[PDB]
Ligand binder design. Structure first.
Ligand SMILES: Nc1ncnc2c1ncn2[C@@H]1O[C@H](COP(=O)(O)OP(=O)(O)O)[C@@H](O)[C@H]1O
Ligand SMILES: Nc1ncnc2c1ncn2[C@@H]1O[C@H](COP(=O)(O)OP(=O)(O)O)[C@@H](O)[C@H]1O
Ligand SMILES: [Mg+2]
Ligand SMILES: [Mg+2]
Lengths: 697, 697
């Protein structure tokens, strides 16, 4: 078993899923990727072992060389290679090895190239006692096909239109039979004109029916695609924060074209399967009515066509993958050569780059020629089959007319019905490329939809609490981004109400993450956060996001009106508080100076303006005031100092001299606090804080 | 004139070129884009007026109002607009205006909407006395077709194959005529078998010829594509430095897809025009031999098909452009929403973003349904034409058979030849959305090809200058990045030969820019650079880059072997030189530790190792020792202090305390040196240097 990887960072998750499927436990790849703690850089070593231990495998890690591979080990094992890429071995045969990488699939390698590419790192697994076999996944194609239930009247008006269109086409095919058998032979003119007019009318009706059906199909496809995309986006916006920072932007954006492929499947394949099977049944019945031998020839033709189509469909996909890889490599080389043009030019080495790029463009050409050869061979074989079958059908029809089994224009009518019967069947046959990528996209999109949401991850919510008014107590708290190095170790503190507090430290100390946990982004793996005697996990999640304002060092303004920006989370406000906050946060003058009306420093002041407009109980500013001018600095200082309604205010800063006038100062050096107290006490109490104060002046 | 913009940042150049073409002066768009001084941020009014004045126009800039638009003045003018875009107005008629924008084309606007979008800035253009007209452009389709001149045996080996394929198909299309006219009527069996076998053999020969022709066509296309892309890349890697920093990477990479489109034009259109012309001439002659009225009916059918194809081809292109724009807007919205999820989650506004995304998705769906309706109308009209024409042809053939003008199977033979004649003409008609998208791509790719490179812009080389050792003189020099504000104003320096020099200053002063001018990158418009008594512009450019080493503020390392990255310029280097270069800048221990032996701090030390491997006359390094620790700092400092062979060394730093022991220290404060001298001499003379030293300690 070799499960194809969906992205470029889930190689280890794919390998672990393959091992689990081999051992009889099939589960969603998204759940495994979340369990391995995979980040944008991938799971280095520890994620696979931890996830296997959680799943019941007796995981272990060992560094082995070519000598260890000779003796023995368990057949399912993950081997680290350097081509964020892991490869799983399966067996050791006579001087050959087999590997099923997510990138390519089940392939075979020799020992020498293996040790050339396989890094000594090795992971061994073995199922434990708690390894109950099961199938913890759902057929996603059925789930997305369930979207057709509301659209059960547009589908019906499409099936009936298809039935009537095919009936009209079959009825109109017999024009050539009526021409030669009765009209031409007996020299009828008025009947000729009447019958020709009738068949023209039939064809016009056919065209109008096709127009109606195409309009309905387009509308249904658009509706289904929009529904799937909106569902995916609405579920994405609800996912926890550990889902976003562990994935790239493109990793989340690709699911829109995945949904487009899903629509291409459901709108097209589901309808055309029934349409083509019923039309093919009608066509085969009619062909058998006309003549049995010619129908058998047609059946042989279509069987050969299908066999050839699939047989050449597989390597065409392989060659397309190869040419895509080569084109990606060439584009990367071009990017590297263009974005570093300065050093290339200031060496006289332009001639070398031309040869280096030619050696890759030639590789791209030689990899495209393989796909061209496959396409040419497939087209030649299909053309041979179709043309020779048509010629043989004409031959057999002529022979049968000679023997008087049929009569003249019956052969031409059979040719028309042959086209009308072979086109639907070949359209049904050449659907495997569409349905395969459709299933791939459906699984890829439905993996995310099974992820737990923020609201349901909460254990419970309190009712009688209305505000976060209470001392902020921090017991022994531990936090680590995924399975990486720890950041929070033994941080213990107490923030009183209504008193401004400044936390100061250097870059990388773990202050922004502390603010993150302060407002329920991520969770502390150890300890608890107490507010007014109540834990942060036992209160309403939406309440925390409503009574806590947060302004970071990377603030931004969305591409929209300023009124929306200042009321991003609030929908019912009046302009009085908006104007007050604009004056309060030193932003009304900026907007008035700006053209029009209320319809990096500017972005920052807008950020504190909206944060204060939120009117919270806790107001957090991490690296915000340092990007303003001195006049704005002191204005913001005295403005945030004179805040009513007993609002707790926290400023995290990297410059000591910027903020001086708080009641209590916290300092964090290496994932922990060393000193805590007022600036007057901090100067008297000799410590690291005094050293940084001296070095900063 | 509304010539399309080939880049997203060259709108102003496009309007200027449109004005010039409307006034009778046509020239390449790349020449105007480099002439206007267009940058990555786009052009402004000053660039437009400067370029127009240099071209001979009496350009001017003025700010107008709504009432000014009502007044009569020079109608052809460029009007600024913020969506910062540029649109040229052509006429202001009675309560209506006419404009032409490169983004869309030529459109009309209303006074209210224009005044809402049009910025007050306005540029007026008028030809001067010396405005001799000209056409400084080449028909670049012919130049790219000239790539077929050496490959003329393959073309002659494809035309003959096409002729033989045509003859075989035409001969084999008479099988149905032979069946019904004589064979079926007279009840011949052995003759039937023989004739059918002969026609099957003819068809097999046709298939083999098609296979051979396809192979040849694929090979020809691959060769043409490779040659064109190689020529374009080799020309690009020679252009001056101002070309790369005035463009985006994608704006230089998309030319490869442009070359692919060019190949699709040359390989497909040029061959198929002749092939289908001969095929259609023969088919039409044969049809006229069979019957005249049916041939006229076929001609009318193909005329209707062509008319419909063009008439619906234009708005299909318009709708495709609109839907592409809507998709770009939607994906930008998704990216900006998903890369700023922190504030969205900590504001409670998950629902609002869903509403905005759904609105944009609905807009995209509507813009896609427009094109769907266009396609459906085109397909329905084409199907009506084809089917009704086939029915009419059958009707007319039956009537002719009744009237004794033709006979039976001749009508079926006419149908076969009718297909064989209509398919080529209806495939040549479908060539319209190939030539347009090929000519635009050819112009876009080939405007670059005529840009003058570094070598031709050089004034004159020298013969007796072999070494750059000597005094470096910087007379009063001016330097502006294109047409922006000046940076280099009055920098006059004297660097003694073989003496280490340190240059210090603030960020954005122009230290790296000065280093760039030193290596002949760009050119000072006023002033000169003197090397040991000789101007820099009088030396061969290959000599300067071969004798000056650069260590930039951000060295990049191209993927590959470290031996190749150290021998980037010279391909003939011994091992011991590499060893001593690695030992020259603390590189041997790091490289020997890596896998095998020789195949940010590490990369930058690698860059310095390469720099001393260049064994130059002048060695310039900026921000080269900052990332290394104090041990490596002092080691490299003592290593570079005691250099031999009279090597001039310039070290540019922003930290004053990093470098102390250079002979002379230069300070860059604001486009001017405030003092020059040794460390001890400059501190005694109170000034800027002492102030910054005291403020940094
Ligand atoms: N998305 C992430 N993935 C992995 N590690 C992270 C991520 N974000 C932050 N970290 C790590 O956690 C630490 C958090 O420190 P931070 O709070 O940013 O310090 P400061 O507040 O002084 O900037 C950083 O040192 C960083 O290495
Ligand atoms: N590649 C470039 N293209 C155009 N302008 C530039 C470029 N690099 C720098 N500049 C401009 O030149 C000025 C001087 O920058 P400089 O002192 O060279 O920066 P640094 O020393 O950090 O390289 C800057 O204000 C900047 O706007
Ligand atoms: Mg931070
Ligand atoms: Mg610099």
């Amino acid at each position: 078993v070799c499960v194809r990887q969906y992205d470029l960072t889930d190689c280890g998750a794919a390998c672990l899923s393959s091992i689990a499927q081999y051992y009889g436990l099939k589960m969603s790849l998204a759940k495994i990727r979340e369990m391995t703690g995979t980040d944008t850089q991938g799971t280095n070593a520890y994620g696979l072992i931890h996830a296997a231990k959680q799943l019941g495998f007796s995981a272990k890690g060992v560094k082995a060389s070519k000598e260890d591979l000779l003796k023995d080990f368990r057949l399912p094992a993950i081997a680290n290679v350097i081509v964020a890429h892991f490869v799983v071995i399966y067996s050791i045969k006579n001087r050959i090895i087999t590997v099923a990488d997510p990138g390519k699939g089940i392939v075979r390698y020799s020992m020498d190239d293996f040790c050339s590419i396989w890094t000594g790192g090795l992971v061994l697994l073995e199922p434990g006692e708690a390894f109950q076999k099961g199938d913890y996944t759902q057929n996603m194609m059925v789930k997305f096909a369930g979207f057709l239930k509301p659209l059960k009247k547009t589908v019906l008006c499409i099936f009936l239109a298809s039935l009537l269109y095919t009936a009209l086409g079959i009825a109109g095919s017999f024009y050539i039979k009526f021409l030669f058998d009765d009209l031409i032979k007996f020299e009828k003119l008025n009947d000729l004109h009447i019958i020709s007019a009738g068949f023209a009318v039939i064809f016009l009706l056919q065209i109008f029916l096709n127009y109606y059906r195409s309009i309905l199909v387009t509308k249904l496809g658009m509706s289904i695609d929009k529904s799937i995309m909106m569902e995916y986006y609405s579920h994405v916006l609800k996912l926890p924060m550990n889902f976003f920072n562990s994935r790239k932007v493109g990793e989340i954006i690709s699911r829109f074209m995945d949904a487009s492929k899903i629509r291409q499947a459901i709108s097209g394949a589901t309808l055309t399967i029934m349409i083509d099977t019923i039309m093919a049944v009608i066509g085969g019945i009619l062909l058998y009515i006309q003549n049995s031998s010619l129908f058998f020839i047609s059946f042989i033709i279509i069987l050969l066509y299908g066999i050839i189509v699939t047989v050449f469909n597989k390597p065409i996909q392989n060659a397309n993958r190869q040419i895509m890889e080569d084109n990606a490599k060439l584009t990367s080389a071009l990017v590297e050569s263009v974005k570093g043009i300065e050093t290339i030019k200031s060496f006289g080495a332009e001639e070398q780059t031309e040869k280096s790029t030619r050696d890759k463009i030639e590789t791209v050409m030689k990899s495209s020629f393989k796909e061209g050869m496959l396409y040419i061979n497939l087209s030649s074989l299909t053309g041979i089959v179709a043309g020779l079958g048509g010629i043989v059908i004409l031959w057999a029809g002529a022979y049968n007319v000679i023997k008087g089994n049929m009569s003249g224009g019956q052969l031409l009518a059979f040719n028309a019905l042959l086209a009308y019967f072979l086109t639907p069947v070949k359209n049904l046959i050449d659907l495997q490329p569409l349905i395969q990528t459709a299933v791939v996209a459906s699984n890829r999109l439905g993996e995310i939809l099974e992820l737990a949401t923020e609201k349901e991850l909460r254990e419970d919510s309190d009712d009688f609490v209305i505000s976060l008014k209470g001392d902020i107590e921090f017991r022994n708290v531990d936090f680590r981004y995924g399975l990486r190095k720890p950041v929070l170790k033994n941080i213990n503190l107490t923030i009183p109400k209504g008193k401004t507090v400044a936390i100061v430290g250097e870059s990388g100390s773990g202050k922004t993450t502390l603010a993150k946990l302060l407002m329920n982004f991520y969770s502390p793996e150890k300890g608890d956060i107490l507010i007014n005697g109540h834990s942060i996990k036992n209160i309403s999640l939406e309440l925390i996001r409503k009574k806590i304002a947060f302004v970071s060092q990377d603030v931004f303004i969305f591409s929209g009106t300023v009124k929306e920006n200042l009321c991003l989370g609030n929908e019912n406000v009046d302009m009085d508080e908006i104007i007050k906050a604009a004056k309060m946060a030193n932003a009304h003058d900026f907007i008035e100076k700006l053209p029009l009306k209320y319809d990096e420093g500017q972005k920052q002041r807008l950020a504190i303006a909206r944060a204060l407009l939120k009117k919270p109980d806790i107001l957090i500013l991490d690296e915000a005031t340092s990007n303003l001018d001195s006049i704005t600095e002191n204005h913001i200082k005295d403005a945030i100092y004179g805040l009513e309604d007993d609002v707790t205010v926290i400023i995290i800063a990297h410059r000591l001299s910027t903020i001086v006038n708080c009641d209590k100062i916290y300092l964090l050096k290496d994932g922990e606090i060393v000193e805590s107290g007022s600036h007057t006490e901090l100067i008297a109490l000799k410590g690291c804080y005094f050293k940084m104060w001296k070095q900063t002046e």
